[PDB]
Amino acid sequence: QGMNAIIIDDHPLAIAAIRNLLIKNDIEILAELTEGGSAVQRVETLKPDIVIIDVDIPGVNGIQVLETLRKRQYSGIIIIVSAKNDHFYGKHCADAGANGFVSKKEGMNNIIAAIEAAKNGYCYFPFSLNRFVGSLTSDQQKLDSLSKQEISVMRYILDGKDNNDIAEKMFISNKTVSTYKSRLMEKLECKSLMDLYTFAQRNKI
């Protein structure tokens, strides 16, 4: 309807399904980035209405591009997307200033619904009844207590990555992987590896 967007995701199939969705609804495509290291600059230059960032872009992760853009006073629409479920990750994109968080696992129709919701000045984030109704409300609060890096170290641990792999992916030292690991294990009140498993399996992460 006369709008445009930039896609920032390095999942080749996801780029296709998003490009097809934006085009099918008359939205122009200024760019398609697969790395964040220039995302902040590209978006500030081309000034697109919509920006779609996968949370797991390499170089600088998806939420980090969102935080920097907002710190640098970018006011346009930003809708974080994920290849995982990552329902707890939605609240963290909230307090960081995003307009949307949609998991590409349930389809592209939530991406377009997140766009029109941001068009109307609203936002389109996952809903966790387990934060207000249930027994896993304490664990959900500890997940909201984590930091931007602690979340990443957690999601990497739940994928089976070692401290060297996490250091290379997050561009930090091995001492910093171990530091994040501890604070993370603390906030979640886990002490052993099995504690983190049953924590993730309880809250389904």
Next chain:
Amino acid sequence: GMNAIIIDDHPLAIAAIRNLLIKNDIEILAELTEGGSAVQRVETLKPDIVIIDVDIPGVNGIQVLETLRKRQYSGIIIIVSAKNDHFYGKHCADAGANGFVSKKEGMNNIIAAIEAAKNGYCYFPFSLNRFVGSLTSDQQKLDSLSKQEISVMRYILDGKDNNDIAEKMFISNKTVSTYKSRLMEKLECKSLMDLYTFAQRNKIG
């Protein structure tokens, strides 16, 4: 195959919302205009959707929510308001709402909030002031007020003196004076002129 209960004493909105729900094959089980019988009658009929104006008399619309969530109601709850009340939305979201839609901005957001809830997401107003600009501080003070201070505030913007509010909230003039000062302290407003400039600068009405 969905059904809903509408709770609102704005006759122009009851017609506004009943029509929109019928336009999407959503049955209307009950049409309340009262807070005291809300929590009881919702659980008696057990509807999928409950749409509640924040200004309903008796029990505050935010309390119908909190009590329904505390009594472990798992259905869709979508708060609405006659004004804009963007700051009010975050208080609903943290209280367990599936959405907060300002009726000032049309009916199509109600149904969009419903769809967002059906898909497991939520639909709340986006507040750019919280993340970008020079009013990020003031927006946090608004996001820190209590559910009472909120109401005590909004009545002062409306233009109700200390006497009306005490009756409108069914409380003593002394307790009104306590809330007002806590409000005035949290908002860093010393005079009534301060609140006018605060409200106008942050666009509250």
